[PDB]
């Protein structure tokens, strides 16, 4: 039976910033001194003959070792305790996901649980929905270590569009009778797009006339999600507003175009799509042309016989003019024909043809007119 000093409790787990009572007791017949050694501030104090009690408050530091001591028979009696603070996982943070992520690519989940301790008792979990992607236990870390970090690389799936990812931190104090403390990050939603290497198909005529209405179509396939893809069509400058319809992962853009005197000649039909951050484009060179209709004119529509009539077919400054089988003489300017009205010329038709070359293409516009020979006696 040696005389001893005792400090209670020996091991203590207090939440950071918290407080606890420490009791020092001794069996020595009379103490010549007594007290408790700590850096911590105290609030309440209690005492007895063989014992002494302090309430230690506002304990921030991960590790502090108090020593309760007594002096009995000119000998120093000692007891050494241990006080360990713990912090709940108040901050659990998942790193921002890529705004758009490629399907078949990899992205990295990063969870961060600052300050939570002790680290050794921490278990971090990365989740996709209710499923656990990875589970990490920190057992074996230093006793004074606070905070934890878990990172994993996940493969993006078409399955994964609109899926929620979260991080889950778990502090296990159960051996100390303090149970479990857990908190989760706000879920992060994942966007997965898939864009095939192919440029969009653009269906257009190579030749377009000013004022004419022709169908134009742009299309693509293998687009996920097809709904989020934004397709732009236009002829040169002017923007077409096609009807974009979605069949499976394929889109179909259908529109109509009229040349405004923008162009004529060399122009581009552009179709560009954006899905995610990626963009595709297809350009078609298109020729526009102005082909003014040939003007067929009679000196008079109605004439008596013997009266002189001049029929002419005039065109724009461009084409080759053919009147009644006779090419314009000379070429490039209106062709004229003259005749004296006969009774046989009543209900007689005249014809003018304009032949224009555009990009090697031969284009014709035919026109007709009818002459009336007024009836009378001779
Ligand atoms: C529709 O019309 C447009 C023009 O309105 C037209 O675009 C042209 O495309 C050709 C190629 O198809 C371009 O030619 C290039 O010209 C550059 C100089 O600017 C050259 O250096 C390029 O040469 C490359 O390839 C060579 C081997 O073939 C290499 O030797 C060289 O190092 C380069 O790698 C290239 O030939 C031309 O510039 C444009 N025109 C304009 C005005 O931008 C387009 O082709 C038409 N579409 C169709 C289907 O015909
Ligand atoms: C701390 O000191 C000792 C720890 O054992 C306590 O001393 C005894 O406390 C019990 C409580 O039921 C009493 O029955 C005994 O008579 C006490 N013994 C003596 C010699 O005092 C003491 O009570 C504790 N003090 C506090 C505030 O917890
Ligand atoms: C669980 O963790 C979340 C995420 O860290 C905590 O929510 C945050 O709370 C603090 C302020 O108290 C701020 O960072 C934000 O207001 C929250 N961040 C968000 C919403 O992303 C939350 O406090 C924790 N829950 C607990 C304590 O159990
Ligand atoms: C899709 O086509 C449009 C046509 O307007 C492009 O818009 C312009 O493109 C020119 C030529 O490259 C650029 O110099 C301009 O900055 C663009 N202007 C405007 C107002 O958009 C557009 O760039 C194309 N889309 C993509 C992704 O390139
Ligand atoms: C200790 O005393 C302070 C005032 O100095 C008081 O505000 C606080 O409540 C006390 N701490 C406790 C009871 O843990
Ligand atoms: C997934 O991520 C791992 C880790 O970087 C990498 O080794 C692997 O190539 C990725 N899978 C792909 C790119 O399909
Ligand atoms: C993802 O989480 C949000 C809440 O943040 C929820 O509204 C949504 O339904 C979830 N998405 C799926 C597909 O579970
Ligand atoms: C028609 O009659 C007029 C007047 O006599 C004459 O000048 C002309 O040569 C005749 N022939 C034609 C085709 O005009
Ligand atoms: C000439 O005009 C007629 C009727 O206006 C039209 O039906 C025909 O297609 C034209 N001829 C040619 C060769 O296009």
Author numbering: 1 to 378
Copy text verbatim from the article accompanying this structure deposition:
ICAM-5, initially called telencephalin, is an integral type I transmembrane glycoprotein of ∼150 kDa that is expressed exclusively in telencephalic neurons. It has nine immunoglobulin superfamily (IgSF) domains, with a total of 832 amino acids in the extracellular region, a single transmembrane segment and a 64-residue cytoplasmic domain. In addition to integrin recognition shared with the other ICAMs, ICAM-5 has unique characteristics within the subfamily, as it mediates homophilic adhesion interactions that promote neurite development. The crystal structure of the four most N-terminal glycosylated domains (D1–D4) of ICAM-5 was determined in three different space groups and the D1–D5 fragment was modelled.
In interface B, D1 interacted similarly with D4 in the P21 and R3 crystal structures. Interface B includes positively and negatively charged surfaces in D1 and D4, respectively, and four salt bridges. This type of zipper could represent of ICAM-5 homophilic cell adhesion complexes. One of the crystal lattices has a molecular assembly that could represent the homophilic ICAM-5 cell adhesion complex in neurons.
